[PDB]
A paper describes a structure:
In the procapsid, the portal is located at a unique vertex inside the DNA-free shell. Asymmetric reconstruction of the portal at a resolution of 8 Å revealed its overall 12-fold symmetric structure, which was similar to a previously reported lower-resolution structure of the procapsid portal (EMD-1828). Local reconstruction with C12 symmetry improved the resolution to 3.0 Å. The [name] gp1 comprises five domains: the clip (residues 344–398), stem (residues 320–343 and 399–416), wing (residues 6–319 and 417–524), and crown (residues 525–600). The C-terminal helical barrel domain (residues 601–725) appeared unstructured. Structural comparison of the procapsid and mature virion portals revealed major differences in the following domains: (1) the top region of the wing domain, which interacted with the SP complex (described below); (2) the stem and clip domains, which likely interacted with the terminase complex motor during DNA packaging; and (3) the helical barrel domain, which was absent in the procapsid. The portal’s helical barrel is fully established after the maturation of the phage [name].
Tailed double-stranded DNA (dsDNA) bacteriophages and their eukaryotic counterparts, such as herpesviruses, possess a dodecameric portal at a unique vertex of the capsid; this portal serves as a channel for DNA packaging during viral assembly and delivery. The portal interacts with multiple copies of a scaffolding protein (SP) to form a nucleation complex, which initiates the assembly of the major capsid protein (i.e., coat protein) and other minor proteins into a procapsid. The [name] procapsid consists of an icosahedral coat comprising 415 coat protein (gene product [gp] 5) subunits, a dodecameric ring comprising [name] (gp1) subunits located at a unique capsid vertex, and an internal core comprising approximately 250–300 SP (gp8) subunits and 3 ejection proteins. In this study, we present the structure of the SP gp8 in complex with the dodecameric portal in the [name] procapsid at subnanometer resolution.
Numbering used by the authors:
A (entry chain I), B (entry chain J): 6 to 197, 217 to 377, 388 to 418, 443 to 599
The structure:
Amino acid sequence: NRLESILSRFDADWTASDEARREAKNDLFFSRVSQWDDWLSQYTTLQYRGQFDVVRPVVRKLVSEMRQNPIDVLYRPKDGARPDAADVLMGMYRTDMRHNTAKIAVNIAVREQIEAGVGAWRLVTDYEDQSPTSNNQVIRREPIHSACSHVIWDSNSKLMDKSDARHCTVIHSMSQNGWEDFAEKYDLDADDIQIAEFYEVVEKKETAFIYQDPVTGEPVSYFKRDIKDVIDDLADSGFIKIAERQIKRRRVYKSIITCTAVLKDKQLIAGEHIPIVPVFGEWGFVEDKEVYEGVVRLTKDGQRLRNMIMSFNADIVARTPKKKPFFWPEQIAGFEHMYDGNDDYPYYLLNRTPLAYYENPEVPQANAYMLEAATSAVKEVATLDLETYVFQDNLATAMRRDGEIYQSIVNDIYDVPRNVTITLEDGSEKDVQLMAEVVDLATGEKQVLNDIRGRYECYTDVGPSFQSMKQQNRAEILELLGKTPQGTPEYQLLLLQYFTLLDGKGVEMMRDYANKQLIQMGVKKPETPEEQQWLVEAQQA
Amino acid sequence: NRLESILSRFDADWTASDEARREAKNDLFFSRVSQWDDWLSQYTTLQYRGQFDVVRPVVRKLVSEMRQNPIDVLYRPKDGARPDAADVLMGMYRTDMRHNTAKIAVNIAVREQIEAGVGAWRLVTDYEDQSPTSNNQVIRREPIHSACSHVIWDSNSKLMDKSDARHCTVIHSMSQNGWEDFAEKYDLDADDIQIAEFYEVVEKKETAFIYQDPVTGEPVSYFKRDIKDVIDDLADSGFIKIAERQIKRRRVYKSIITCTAVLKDKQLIAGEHIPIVPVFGEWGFVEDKEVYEGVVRLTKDGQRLRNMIMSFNADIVARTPKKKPFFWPEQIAGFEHMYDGNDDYPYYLLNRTPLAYYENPEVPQANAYMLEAATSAVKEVATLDLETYVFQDNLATAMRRDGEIYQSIVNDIYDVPRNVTITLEDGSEKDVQLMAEVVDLATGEKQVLNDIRGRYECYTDVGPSFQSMKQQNRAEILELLGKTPQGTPEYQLLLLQYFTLLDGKGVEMMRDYANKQLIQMGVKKPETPEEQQWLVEAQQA
């Protein structure tokens, strides 16, 4: 009976999102296969069906604009978590998003966002460091291709993160080969080929009936049955009722079903949220129906008009310009070897009983402005900001959902003492241990160092990229150097700070000299004992 | 029966990729042989089929624009490997990618990426230093020509690296002569001519059933049979079960088969991955079908329109402009020697019983904008960024796959103490020994120096080339020299650092003087004992 409930929910979601999925699939097929939909091939008579598109330049420009305004993910430390743990999570997320597989997933999701309207990349977990001694795991992102048709979000949820959604499938259209490999890979090779991955979020909601006493109110009456266990204590306490806080606890469950046969895996736990994170284009609710778009429908209509115009011109062209004449069979009764085009004779002969020709088509020459209007419509209705704010905000919201999912999975995996790599800002690689059980020297307590496990909320700061920040800083410092009298310690400090803001391999010695001069000057704090020795040597000099 | 399984897999892959291979072959044939496909030769009547193409200028611009933004491959050192081994692999990959054969392979792959959509160059290994004393091997890259039709990737893999692909053939369409040479070269001259190279990746997957004790959990129950060997120990241990880490181990296998006759070689090992690395153009999944494109389909339609327009013009031109008249045979009964064009007579005679002419075609003069629209479409729909980001990103991803394959092969061949050449950055060539078994002086341990063998993952940094970095550095230093008061040690340091950033042979003497002054100043660290003597001479002076 369980599979009947699963398929009822899946069919409800499918039929509810059918219209949006149809239009998105048509958009994707238009932007990747052929501009000439079947409707258009019915309403037309043109014989040279061509595709002189200007959509892909627009999509490329939009993707490039997004790529040039990178989005970072931060972490607010909550419930008294130390800022250093927040920094460690920021670094681990940065190094798990700079990994090339994650870049491929994000790029595919963005491209299908801009073209179709939905991209929906996915999170997944797997082991590293292949050896049975440990059980270390990492986080990589497998993209979901054509996510407008292979991901069926819960129709009921009404948030763009799809946070409220309590289930979302991932259809896989497998043939025989896909069948046996994706069957032997995980569960069993039991034959029944469209398989599914029905994610699920199960929750436990109660009342918890907080009660108050002279002392601070501890959790009492956690259930309704505990109330019936304290029928006397509820009346013997100082206060009878204060609040009805409905405590909630949730865990994500994953099941692999099939349409015909029974489900293959009943329930499995992986993380806390459903890993699939969707991106959407211009997304909103119209008459209580989810509708999402891209930058391909509008350019699609314009592009169909342009294709029609250019195909019409090509249809005019591909006719031999030589005139075809009209005359009676007895008008050339004998003289038929003259009119073949295989020879050119001085004069043309016609017997007893002057002729009319077949009118070739003429180019309207009014199609100049027509074509220009269509092409300009495609090239401006789509784009032109400095980045399409709606698409950038949508990507930011989806990346924040990705941050929440990644943080929860990190919280639930990074438990065992581990060694991880952290990409601090400015690409500075670093190595950090997670637990670092070392006992303090002057304190006497245990004081585990990092202890990533906690509770965190994600918030993204879209805007000035770090390299752009540094370039603007260098420009400002150079301007000040232009507008400051020389010799004064302010000028020397500004020049030294400009030195320390330079680039890498070429001027490394200048940057190192600047650091030495700053530290021995006393403005920049030392960070290593050699710098401390330099500082004391300069001071005592 | 083995060959039947091989051919089943190969036929499945072939029929699954048939549509994409057909369209890519048509694209390549259009961009290298003749613009006039057979379809167009059916829908047309023009007699002068011409090719006034503007596709190849676009492809040339794109390839050059790639060439001006070179991609480097880096190496993250993992599992506690020293950074010096990482630097040695960095330089070794650089010197194996700067070799001319590798440049030919990469150039052919990129050219076929831009034209057709797939380039798929190939890794291969062979001996150097021909002498039986040793067995040293090197890595060179043999290009695969027309890779859209001679390489059939596994249909089931779903990554642009084709990393997931677990087999991939390489068809060779050989005639008799190719048959005997490619048969005697490796296996045997046993006659059966399309031969194949069926690469394969086999894996061993188990459960490994980690068990935990008071001490750290060592690898126990590596197999399921070892569990049945410890039926007592599993119950006598402190903990019964913690995790089920499915350890995996993979190794490549290569087999040379033929369609009709039996396979020639059953299995051979070469490296760890399948050497073939593909590049793709705009690549994505549409309705669960692999579709990849180039910059030739869109320009292809535009180019067909331009060809038709100019051929129409040329068909108008090639006619005698002399008018051909229409008149009865008895209208010139006697005077037939007048109308031949072989003479020019003063007057023209006509007997008893004024005439009509044959209308030559006229140039519509509306074709000006037609031709301009078609040509401009070809020249802008294709290109215009500063590099086509999708093509550059795909090349970067393929080069990262090349890095992984090269690193696996280097790890698996460079075991014996060898001597290699390293191309450090800025072309500074260097000779380095790999093992360098020298025992330490003040330590007392063995401490092999480089020991390339390890476990590295590749990551590419596409962007500013090193020469561009140096030119920008020189520009910045020159600007500071323009905006800094003279005499001060900062100005002198800037001038000397500008000196040390100059070019080669011409100004070597100033660069050497600058190094001497920097080292005697104490800013740049000495790198050789003569510089140390210079430093102490300057200091004690």
